[PDB]
Write a protein that binds this DNA or RNA. Structure first.
Length: 68
DNA sequence: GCTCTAATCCCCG
DNA sequence: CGGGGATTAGAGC
């Protein structure tokens, strides 16, 4: 990683990220360009957030597995 | 340095 | 090409 954490989030980036996510729950170039302009963050951080969001979701649900 | 955890390097499909 | 499993490495305490 030659220079990780070239960015640091806040509640305002999570507020954008989540509200433009709702309109396209998977990334593409257009989803990623549009969020990059609005958050005022690189297109690489948008990917890295969508990825981190799925991991946080499915981690917390696996810790709450059930059975029948 | 431990801790927080978003970011990093290889794989899945 | 992004999801993403498992681990690395910078921001904060």
């Amino acid at each position: 990683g030659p220079r990780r954490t070239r960015t640091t989030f806040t509640s305002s980036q999570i507020a954008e990220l989540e509200q433009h996510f709702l309109q396209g729950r998977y990334l593409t170039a257009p989803r990623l360009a549009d969020l990059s302009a609005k958050l005022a963050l690189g297109t690489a951080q948008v990917k890295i957030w969508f990825k981190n969001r799925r991991r946080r979701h499915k981690i917390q649900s696996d810790q709450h597995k059930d059975q029948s």
